[PDB]
């Protein structure tokens, strides 16, 4: 009957204020949010605010973009969905008419409306929200709304592996065993790769990498990453190197890890500049940045529903919605022990 939202009142400080229940436009669904994931971008938003200040002096800055729930109402022209459907949402709604949308790259649309961002700052941390039916997806019966929430980061890794043309016979190195690195690992497995090395510095993440199917795990703090990778690839380098931690160490490392003619994929981020040794990759190596996802939700939902892609095992912490402040503090303070945290929104 009533709504509320968690707002970034000032960087580092969340609270929950009242909000009106949105009315779905004729092509939208109205969803009762049940789970909201916490990823790097939300934690950075909590710490710094959005990097474009709101045009409005006292704009209510929402947070959260990975979410799922149950349809409560639908707009008058919605046929795909009905009240009671459990769904997730793809949080980036592109313009649909620019050169990039029309060319199959809507993810890089210059007018994408992405949750908890620039023009509108609509956060998924709320009891009720509206979303276009075209970017909402029904969950299989064997997939709960917490799994539906984690389709979004899984889609990030799926898009990277698909962009990279992962295939059997391609040796893969994944730099980073955080959430996105583990998603990329499982995506590489779904695309048939059989030799996957995963590099991180935390033994708990490498334990999870091995559980999720890494062929070899390498602790860059206790081992020589370049030497161990050269052994892994028989001194030839890997066909594909994924950089997923967004750190300077890893990006600068990837040139030394890839084979001639191979690919380096930068899965998101990299906030600072990084010095690249192009001499080491002068034989037609490709470096490509990877940005969110395009047309990946169905195949990712498929992969999770089948059991081949395990997102439930990645959830290490579940926070109640009214405890959202601690959820974001711990996501900063105890980053060491969190693979993936989610926020449960019950009444
Ligand atoms: Mg995400
Ligand atoms: Zn567009």
**How far is residue 121's CA from residue 284's CA, in Å, rounded to a whole number?**
41
Question: For residue 159, which ligand has an atom nearest its CA?
Answer: 1
Q: What is the set of domains in the chain, with CATH numbers? A: 1-153+293-347 (3.90.180.10), 157-290 (no CATH)
Question: For residue 93, which ligand has an atom nearest its CA?
Answer: 2
| 96 alpha carbon – ligand 2 mean position (Å) | 5
Residues whose CB is less than 8 angstroms from the CB of residue 141 and which lie 6 or more positions away in sequence, other chains included:
none
**Angle (CA) 129 145 93, round 5°:** 45
Question: For residue 110, which ligand has an atom nearest its CA?
Answer: 2
Dihedral class, residue 145 (left if φ above 0, else alpha if ψ from -120 to 50, else beta)? alpha
Radius of gyration of the chain (CA): 20
Q: How far is CA 313 from the centre of its chain?
A: 16
Question: For residue 102, which ligand has an atom nearest its CA?
Answer: 2
Buried b (16+ CB within 10 A) or exposed e, 255-286: bebbbeebbbbbbbbbeeeeeeeeeebeeebe
Closest CA to 242 of 223, 263, 270, 226: 263
Q: Report yes or no: 180 and 203 within 8 Å, Cβ to Cβ.
A: no
| 33 alpha carbon – ligand 1 mean position (Å) | 16
Q: Token pair of 125, please?
A: 């941390």
Question: For residue 152, which ligand has an atom nearest its CA?
Answer: 1
**How far is residue 114's CA from residue 92's CA, in Å, rounded to a whole number?**
4
Burial class, 103, CB count within 10 angstroms (exposed 0-12 / middle 13-18 / buried 19+): exposed
| 288 alpha carbon – ligand 2 mean position (Å) | 21
Beta-carbon neighbour count of residue 133 at 10 Å?
Answer: 21
Dihedral class, residue 213 (left if φ above 0, else alpha if ψ from -120 to 50, else beta)? left
| 106 alpha carbon – ligand 2 mean position (Å) | 6
| 300 alpha carbon – ligand 1 mean position (Å) | 14
Closest CA to 158 of 135, 180, 143, 136: 180
Resolution value (Å, 1 decimal): 2.0
**How far is residue 313's CA from residue 324's CA, in Å, rounded to a whole number?**
22
Q: Report yes or no: 257 and 238 within 8 Å, Cβ to Cβ.
A: yes
Q: What is the 3-state secondary structure (H, E, C) of 267-292?
A: ECCCCCCCCCCHHHHCCCCEEEEECC
Q: Report yes or no: 77 and 26 within 8 Å, Cβ to Cβ.
A: yes
Question: For residue 115, which ligand has an atom nearest its CA?
Answer: 1
| 58 alpha carbon – ligand 1 mean position (Å) | 26
| 261 alpha carbon – ligand 2 mean position (Å) | 32
Question: For residue 63, which ligand has an atom nearest its CA?
Answer: 1
Q: Token pair of 212, please?
A: 């999720």
Residues whose CB is less than 8 angstroms from the CB of residue 134 and which lie 6 or more positions away in sequence, other chains included:
27, 93
Q: Dihedrals φ, ψ of 266, to 5°?
A: -100, 105
Which residues lie near ion ligand 1 (Cβ < 5 Å)? 39, 66, 152-153
Q: Report yes or no: 201 and 219 within 8 Å, Cβ to Cβ.
A: yes
Question: For residue 100, which ligand has an atom nearest its CA?
Answer: 2
Length of the chain, in residues: 347
Asked whether the CA dihedral 314, 319, 321, 327 is positive or negative, the reply is: negative
């Amino acid at each position: 009957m009533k709504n509320s939202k968690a707002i970034l009142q000032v960087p580092g400080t969340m609270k929950i204020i009242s909000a009106e229940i949105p009315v779905p436009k004729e092509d939208e669904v109205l969803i009762k949010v049940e789970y909201v994931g916490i990823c790097g971008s939300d934690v950075h938003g909590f710490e710094s605010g959005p990097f474009i200040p709101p045009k409005d002096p006292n704009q209510e800055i929402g947070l959260g973009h990975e979410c799922a729930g149950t349809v409560v109402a639908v707009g008058s022209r919605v046929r795909k969905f009905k009240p009671g459907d459990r769904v997730n949402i793809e949080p980036g709604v592109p313009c649909g008419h620019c050169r990039y949308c029309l060319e199959g790259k809507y993810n890089i649309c210059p007018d994408v409306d992405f949750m908890a961002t620039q023009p509108n700052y609509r956060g998924a941390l709320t009891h009720y929200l509206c979303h276009p039916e075209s970017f909402t997806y029904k969950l299989p019966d064997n997939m709960d709304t917490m799994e539906g929430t984690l389709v979004e980061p899984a889609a990030v890794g799926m898009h990277a592996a698909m962009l990279a043309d992962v295939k059997p016979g391609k040796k893969i190195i994944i730099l980073g065993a955080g959430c996105i690195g583990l998603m990329t690992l499982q995506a590489c497995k779904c695309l048939g790769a059989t030799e996957i090395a995963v590099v991180d510095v935390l033994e708990k993440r490498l334990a999870m990498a091995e559980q999720l199917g890494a062929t070899v795990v390498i602790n860059g703090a206790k081992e020589d990453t370049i030497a161990r990778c050269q052994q892994f690839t028989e001194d030839m380098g890997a066909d594909i190197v994924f950089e997923t931690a967004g750190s300077a160490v890893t990006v600068k490392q990837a040139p030394y890890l890839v084979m001639r003619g191979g690919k380096i994929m930068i899965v998101g981020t990299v906030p600072g500049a990084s010095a690249i040794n192009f001499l080491k990759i002068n034989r037609e190596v490709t470096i490509q940045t990877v940005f969110r996802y395009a047309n990946r939700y169905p195949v990712t939902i498929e992969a999770i529903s089948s059991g081949r892609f395990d997102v439930k095992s990645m959830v290490t912490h579940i926070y109640d919605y009214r405890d959202v402040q601690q959820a974001f503090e711990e996501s900063v303070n105890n980053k060491r022990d969190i693979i993936k945290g989610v926020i449960k929104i019950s009444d």
